[PDB]
Amino acid sequence: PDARAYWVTSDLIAWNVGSVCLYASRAAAMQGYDSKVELQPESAGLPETVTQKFPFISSYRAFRVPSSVDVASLVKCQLVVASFVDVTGLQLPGVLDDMFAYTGPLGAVFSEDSVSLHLWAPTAQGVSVCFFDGPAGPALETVQLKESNGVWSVTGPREWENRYYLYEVDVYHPTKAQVLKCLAGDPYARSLSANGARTWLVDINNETLKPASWDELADEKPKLDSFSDITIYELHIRDFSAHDGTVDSDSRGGFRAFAYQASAGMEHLRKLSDAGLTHVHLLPSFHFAGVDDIKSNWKFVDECELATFPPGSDMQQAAVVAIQEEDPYNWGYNPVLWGVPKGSYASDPDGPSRIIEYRQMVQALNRIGLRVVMDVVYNHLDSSGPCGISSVLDKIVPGYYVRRDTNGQIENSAAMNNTASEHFMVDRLIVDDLLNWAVNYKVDGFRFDLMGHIMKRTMMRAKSALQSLTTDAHGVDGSKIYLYGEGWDFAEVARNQRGINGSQLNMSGTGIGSFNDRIRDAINGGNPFGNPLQQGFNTGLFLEPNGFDTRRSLATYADQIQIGLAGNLRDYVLISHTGEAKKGSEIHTFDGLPVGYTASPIETINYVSAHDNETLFDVISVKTPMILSVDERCRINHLASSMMALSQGIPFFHAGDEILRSKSIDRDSYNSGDWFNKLDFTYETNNWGVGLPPSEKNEDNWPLMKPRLENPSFKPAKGHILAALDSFVDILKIRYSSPLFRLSTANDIKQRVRFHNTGPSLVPGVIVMGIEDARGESPEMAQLDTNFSYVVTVFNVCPHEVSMDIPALASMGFELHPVQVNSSDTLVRKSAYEAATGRFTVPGRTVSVFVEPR
Ligand SMILES: OC[C@H]1O[C@H](O[C@H]2[C@H](O)[C@@H](O)[C@@H](O[C@H]3[C@H](O)[C@@H](O)[C@@H](O[C@H]4[C@H](O)[C@@H](O)[C@@H](O)O[C@@H]4CO)O[C@@H]3CO)O[C@@H]2CO)[C@H](O)[C@@H](O)[C@@H]1O
Ligand SMILES: OC[C@H]1O[C@H](O[C@H]2[C@H](O)[C@@H](O)[C@@H](O[C@H]3[C@H](O)[C@@H](O)[C@@H](O[C@H]4[C@H](O)[C@@H](O)[C@@H](O)O[C@@H]4CO)O[C@@H]3CO)O[C@@H]2CO)[C@H](O)[C@@H](O)[C@@H]1O
Ligand SMILES: OC[C@H]1O[C@H](O[C@H]2[C@H](O)[C@@H](O)[C@@H](O[C@H]3[C@H](O)[C@@H](O)[C@@H](O)O[C@@H]3CO)O[C@@H]2CO)[C@H](O)[C@@H](O)[C@@H]1O
Ligand SMILES: [Ca+2]
């Protein structure tokens, strides 16, 4: 309901009114009040601490609450303020933090002879714990908790260990205008019964929950010398093994599939890892809503039936959509409890298997040379309110963990039920959760979904806390833990309205990565929410119009790409296409923001593809001329991935980039099932032409999709898929062949990286990037590379051979990179350098890497 006033401190209420009284009713009877308190205007106004925490109400009038008021009692009541007649509810987070900020133990604490439970519920009238013996059995016992400063607690005997439980919370819910008895899980849960119906009272440190040699994992972690050595591969746990016939049927789709060391999927990851891939980013793997943890409840359509339907038919999606709410599939961006592994990915959803198997997965990946990144989703909740298994946080302290507008309505810009990390206990829970995953599961990094919705102070505190973990004290080397996220700035958090948020610009100089949407859009063309047929640097703009000024548009995109290739730095200086020398931050995007915004290459996550939006293969198939062969499109796929793999900064690959993965042009496949998200590690298909994708997100584009999906010339064969994989692995090998591709500082990049095809007379469709190392005695720089003294990369998107003469690079000892001399691709082997003129000759649609050997 309507809540326009804010209770910001124990003694201050803020309200934007041009006499004011506070009314309270413990029974929610409001006439009907048990308390009436006149508020006096506070001539001192709002303190600086209040305006800093809640900038959007800095203009509001301040009213003093008399110190004789029992604030702790009143916050448990139905409350209104009235002006003299305007009446409105009160938003309590400010006063709840001021009075009841709590840093003590929450959830379960185990000592030698006892177990304690602590729940933060300062607005609750009563809290009990209901114990169950077993995940499905009836209640065995109820015990009352005692309150101190808004925290409810009880201490019991050690025998309480491994019971299941829920909290019975009597609390006022504004959405129902009643004090309701709510049955709630523990926000600090570390395990659950199926679907989070009950919390398992488990000691996360219990030795039987640790796989063999778990405590020695630190010794077995893959080497990571620098964050600048990171490459990331983004993978969904179910996608990985759902279709993998080399994994036993009962272990497909979950954590256990990673324990099959010689499966097609694991052999695929070993191949990438051995080539130099360092990190695998797993899509949400905590307790999310939308998939039943009980596998026998899953509905699946028969894939053999779906395979009989025409390639451009709407029948496949109709079938999938009919049961998409009851199938095994979701990306999982629907948070319920952050600190527990998803039950649907475990062999048994009740109790220990989800803990052990998660740990086994981390161990398995580490032992094949891959560090593990978790996709963490702290920006919103699946559900709010007092009802249902899927609401926990807002069930216990309504209106606190969620961000609300100035009328008191929940903000939904993230998707639904935005969180308010600006509130003390939300911040606490986020950081506590991160430490849980880092310490209890030895996770190597975190990707923050909608980091722009998270306060920068939360991000920086998390970074500090994680980075200071040690092997001696905590079992993990915190100094190697890497953080990155989506720094999009929109809706209610834009322009720092709720405080300094984790936007791209605000995270410059923090050492926390953000996705570079500039290089993505310049390469592919347009934007995910723009015209689908708008072409870019690598999809035929100017050079190969699709038929649905452009020389200058192409050159503008080339400038944006080059800033990205040099780590997307604010201060890197480029000769722009007009001839003027410009800093990365002085080259602007179409919406007026600086292209280059980082202080370091480690703050840039360079990508052309991810789980969101169309796959690399699909975007290329939509934007390029219809007349191109699939053979040509395969080369274009390789060019895009190579621009990432040979960029300064941190390359990010979508799982399947390397094997032409399609989703039949689905732009948002979160609930599109295994059918549209198929990862085929037999390499027989890429999943192109499996029907029109679900109407929900795609129907407006079906007319462009249908003819392409139906055209057999668009579909690659196994040969194309294997060719893509081989060349992908080669370019990875090249990145890790020389530290020059992975410079660690902006200073190094400004000193060493130069672009050689620039200015108003630049050759369209070609980027030439040179990287210098020390050469000769008493050099101007340190020697980073023992094998090569100089590297030159030529990206040629033209459909014809090009010869680039660079006088600066003439009379040197350049050769084609040994990996490319040794390539299975016939075209790249034809690449050549001629010293007399410094001429680099590169075939059409090819990336050629040249080295000067020592
Ligand atoms: O198979 C028989 C061999 O068994 C033993 O070696 C194993 C290791 O025990 C495994 O853990 C693994 O280790 C490899 C890993 O597969 C490989 O990717 C690479 O790891 C790199 C990583 O890729 C890279 O990103 C970088 O950052 O650091 C990692 C190294 O820290 O190298 C690992 C080996 O060092 O596989 C090998 C088999 O290759 C046993 O020791 C051998 O004697 C035996 O032959
Ligand atoms: O939350 C529900 C929605 O979630 C998913 O949307 C994602 C997109 O898939 C991502 O691409 C991203 O969107 C970013 C975008 O990547 C980024 O470039 C930026 O785009 C702006 C652009 O800078 C600007 O010039 C202009 O053209 O508008 C663009 C979009 O407004 O910002 C986007 C975020 O605002 O993140 C979102 C998450 O919201 C999903 O695909 C959707 O179906 C779903 O609705
Ligand atoms: O179901 C009611 C719910 O509908 C609306 O939220 C939906 C989004 O509109 C929809 O896009 C989808 O969001 C997912 C993204 O598509 C996906 O890319 C990824 O980011 O995960 C998102 C969450 O799963 O689903 C939600 C939920 O159905 C509406 O905005 C809500 O207010 C409303 O409650
Ligand atoms: Ca589903």
Pocket test for ligand 1, best of 273, 373, 733 (most atoms within 8 A of CB): 273
**Helix axes of 702-710 and 616-623: crossing angle, nearest 10 degrees:** 100
Residue 64, token pair as written in the block: 């003093």
Taking Cα atoms as reference points, which of 743, 755, 762, 749 lies closest to residue 802? 762
CB atoms within 10 A of CB 142: 11
Inter-residue contact 496 to 460 (CB < 8 Å): no
| Burial class for 216, CB neighbours closer than 10 Å (0-12, 13-18, 19+) | exposed
Backbone angles phi, psi at 467, to 5 degrees: -65, -20
Q: Which residue has the tokens 């409840």?
A: 297
Beta partners for residue 181, in sequence order: 170
- Map residue 375 onto helix, strand or coil: strand
Length of the chain equals 854
Contacts with 348 (C-beta within 8 Å, 6 or more apart), sequence order? 354
Is the alpha carbon torsion for 400, 406, 407, 409 positive or negative? negative
Whole-angstrom distance, CA of residue 566 vs CA of residue 746:
9
| Burial class for 18, CB neighbours closer than 10 Å (0-12, 13-18, 19+) | exposed
Whole-angstrom distance, CA of residue 652 vs CA of residue 224:
17
Whole-angstrom distance, CA of residue 375 vs CA of residue 279:
12
- Does the beta carbon of 71 lie inside 6 Å of ligand 3? no
| Kind plus residue range of the DSSP H or E element containing 393 | helix 393-396
Amino acid at 789: S
Question: Which residue has a Cα nearest atom 23 of ligand 1?
Answer: 369
Residue 634, token pair as written in the block: 């395969």
Whole-angstrom distance, CA of residue 164 vs CA of residue 140:
10
Q: Is 475 left (phi over 0), alpha (psi -120 to 50) or beta?
A: left
Inter-residue contact 634 to 590 (CB < 8 Å): no
Amino acid at 177: A
Inter-residue contact 651 to 570 (CB < 8 Å): no
Q: How far apart are the first and last CA of the chain?
A: 73
Question: Which residue has a Cα nearest atom 33 of ligand 1?
Answer: 369
Q: Which residue has the tokens 């639904």?
A: 416
| Burial class for 603, CB neighbours closer than 10 Å (0-12, 13-18, 19+) | buried
| Burial class for 722, CB neighbours closer than 10 Å (0-12, 13-18, 19+) | middle
Whole-angstrom distance, CA of residue 95 vs CA of residue 795:
58
Q: Which residue has the tokens 């894939």?
A: 303
- Does the beta carbon of 124 lie inside 6 Å of ligand 1? no
Whole-angstrom distance, CA of residue 157 vs CA of residue 294:
32
Inter-residue contact 62 to 12 (CB < 8 Å): yes
- Map residue 812 onto helix, strand or coil: coil
Go through 430-458 and write b for each residue having 16 or more CB atoms within 10 A of its CB, e for each that does not.
bbbbbbbbbbbbbbbbbbbbbbbbbbbeb
Inter-residue contact 597 to 572 (CB < 8 Å): no
Per-residue DSSP letters for 635-671?
HHHHHHHHHHHTSBSEEEEETTGGGT---TT-S--TT
Amino acid at 15: W
Backbone angles phi, psi at 637, to 5 degrees: -60, -45
> Edge-to-edge strand order for the sheet containing 846-853?
753-755, 766-772, 788-796, 846-853, 815-816
Backbone angles phi, psi at 612, to 5 degrees: -70, 145
Per-residue DSSP letters for 80-104?
EEEE--EEE-EE-HHHHHHHH---S
Whole-angstrom distance, CA of residue 189 vs CA of residue 393:
12
- The CA distances from residue 526 to 522, 536, 799, in Å, are 7, 7, 21
- The CA distances from residue 712 to 305, 310, 532, 631, 686, in Å, are 20, 12, 21, 13, 13
Of all atoms in ligand 3, which is nearest to the CA of residue 412? 32
Whole-angstrom distance, CA of residue 171 vs CA of residue 28:
10
- The CA distances from residue 747 to 332, 571, 651, in Å, are 40, 10, 20
* 24, 28, 32, 37: CA torsion to nearest 10: 0
Inter-residue contact 764 to 551 (CB < 8 Å): yes
Whole-angstrom distance, CA of residue 767 vs CA of residue 88:
61
Residue 130, token pair as written in the block: 């209901």
CA–centroid distance, residue 320 to ligand 4 (Å): 9
Beta partners for residue 147, in sequence order: 152
Whole-angstrom distance, CA of residue 331 vs CA of residue 613:
13
Per-residue DSSP letters for 517-573?
HHHHHHHH-S-TTS-TT---TTTTTTTS-----HHHHHHHHHHHHHHHHBT-BSS-E
Rg (CA), the chain: 29
Backbone angles phi, psi at 288, to 5 degrees: -115, 155
- The CA distances from residue 549 to 139, 514, 541, 585, in Å, are 73, 32, 11, 24
**Helix axes of 424-440 and 93-100: crossing angle, nearest 10 degrees:** 60
For residue 324, the Cα-to-chain-centroid distance in whole angstroms is 23
- Does the beta carbon of 488 lie inside 6 Å of ligand 3? no
Whole-angstrom distance, CA of residue 113 vs CA of residue 129:
19
- The CA distances from residue 202 to 133, 198, 205, 268, in Å, are 13, 12, 9, 36
Residue 450, token pair as written in the block: 């909608």
Inter-residue contact 795 to 755 (CB < 8 Å): no
Pocket test for ligand 3, best of 333, 381, 384 (most atoms within 8 A of CB): 333
Amino acid at 555: A
Q: Where are the alpha helices (DSSP H) in 663-755?
A: 673-677, 695-698, 702-710, 718-735, 746-752
CA 672, 674, 680 angle in degrees (round to 5)? 130
Amino acid at 92: L
CB atoms within 10 A of CB 113: 8
Task: Check if 657 is active-site.
Answer: no
Residue 215, token pair as written in the block: 């405590």
Residue 81, token pair as written in the block: 């303020």
**Helix (H), strand (E), coil (C) string for 426-479:** HHHHHHHHHHHHHHHCCCCEEEECCHHHCEHHHHHHHHHHHHCCCHHHHCCCHH
- Map residue 415 onto helix, strand or coil: coil
- The CA distances from residue 733 to 189, 341, 389, 609, 720, in Å, are 42, 34, 48, 20, 20
Q: Which residues fall in the annotated binding site for Ca(2+)?
A: 273, 277, 324, 327, 329, 369, 671
- Does the beta carbon of 491 lie inside 6 Å of ligand 3? no
For the chain, domains (ranges, CATH) are 1-98 (2.60.40.1130), 99-203 (2.60.40.10), 204-777 (3.20.20.80), 778-854 (2.60.40.1180)
- Map residue 574 onto helix, strand or coil: strand
Whole-angstrom distance, CA of residue 291 vs CA of residue 295:
9
Taking Cα atoms as reference points, which of 408, 34, 381, 386 lies closest to residue 176? 386
Is the alpha carbon torsion for 282, 283, 286, 290 positive or negative? negative
- Map residue 216 onto helix, strand or coil: helix
Q: Which residues fall in the annotated binding site?
A: 273, 277, 324, 327, 329, 369, 671
DSSP character for 207? G
CB atoms within 10 A of CB 740: 23
- Which residue in the list 186, 486, 489, 614 is annotated as catalytic? 486
- Does the beta carbon of 267 lie inside 6 Å of ligand 1? no
CB atoms within 10 A of CB 607: 26
Inter-residue contact 300 to 319 (CB < 8 Å): no
Inter-residue contact 78 to 28 (CB < 8 Å): yes
CA–centroid distance, residue 330 to ligand 4 (Å): 5
**Helix axes of 550-565 and 517-524: crossing angle, nearest 10 degrees:** 140
Contacts with 549 (C-beta within 8 Å, 6 or more apart), sequence order? none
DSSP character for 223? P
Report the pocket of ligand 2 as residue ranges, CB < 6 Å. Answer: 415, 488, 490, 517, 527-529, 590-591, 612-613, 668, 697
Whole-angstrom distance, CA of residue 202 vs CA of residue 205:
9
CA–centroid distance, residue 391 to ligand 3 (Å): 16
CA–centroid distance, residue 676 to ligand 4 (Å): 12
Whole-angstrom distance, CA of residue 794 vs CA of residue 796:
6
CA–centroid distance, residue 639 to ligand 1 (Å): 30
Inter-residue contact 119 to 151 (CB < 8 Å): yes
Per-residue DSSP letters for 228-288?
GG--EEEE-HHHHHTT-TTS-GGGTTSGGGGG-TTSHHHHHHHHHHHHT--EEEEP--EEE
CA–centroid distance, residue 729 to ligand 1 (Å): 17
Q: Residues followed by a break in the chain, C–N over 2.5 Å? A: 18, 30, 84, 548
How large is the greatest C-alpha to C-alpha distance in the chain, in angstroms? 95
Question: Which residue has a Cα nearest atom 32 of ligand 1?
Answer: 369
CA 759, 760, 761 angle in degrees (round to 5)? 95
| Structural determination approach | X-ray
CB atoms within 10 A of CB 631: 13
Whole-angstrom distance, CA of residue 259 vs CA of residue 249:
14
Task: Check if 449 is active-site.
Answer: yes
Residue 643, token pair as written in the block: 């621009």
Inter-residue contact 340 to 192 (CB < 8 Å): yes
Whole-angstrom distance, CA of residue 164 vs CA of residue 200:
4
- Which residue in the list 293, 357, 449, 544 is annotated as catalytic? 449
Question: Which residue has a Cα nearest atom 14 of ligand 2?
Answer: 488
Taking Cα atoms as reference points, which of 145, 93, 101, 175 lies closest to residue 386? 175
Inter-residue contact 757 to 767 (CB < 8 Å): yes
DSSP character for 819? H
Beta partners for residue 780, in sequence order: none
DSSP character for 192? B
- The CA distances from residue 484 to 376, 414, 481, 565, 635, in Å, are 10, 18, 10, 18, 30
Taking Cα atoms as reference points, which of 185, 203, 200, 191 lies closest to residue 111? 203
| Kind plus residue range of the DSSP H or E element containing 319 | helix 315-322
CA 448, 454, 457 angle in degrees (round to 5)? 110
Contacts with 500 (C-beta within 8 Å, 6 or more apart), sequence order? 455, 456, 457, 506
Per-residue DSSP letters for 43-73?
TT-S-HHHHHH-GGGTTSEEEEPPTTS-HHH
Per-residue DSSP letters for 576-630?
-TTS-EEETTTSB-TTS-BS--BSSGGGEEE-S--SSSS-HHHHHHHHS-TTS-H
- Does the beta carbon of 334 lie inside 6 Å of ligand 3? yes
Whole-angstrom distance, CA of residue 536 vs CA of residue 521:
7
Q: Which residue has the tokens 């606490």?
A: 428
| Burial class for 417, CB neighbours closer than 10 Å (0-12, 13-18, 19+) | buried
> Edge-to-edge strand order for the sheet containing 832-834?
802-805, 839-842, 832-834
CB atoms within 10 A of CB 799: 16
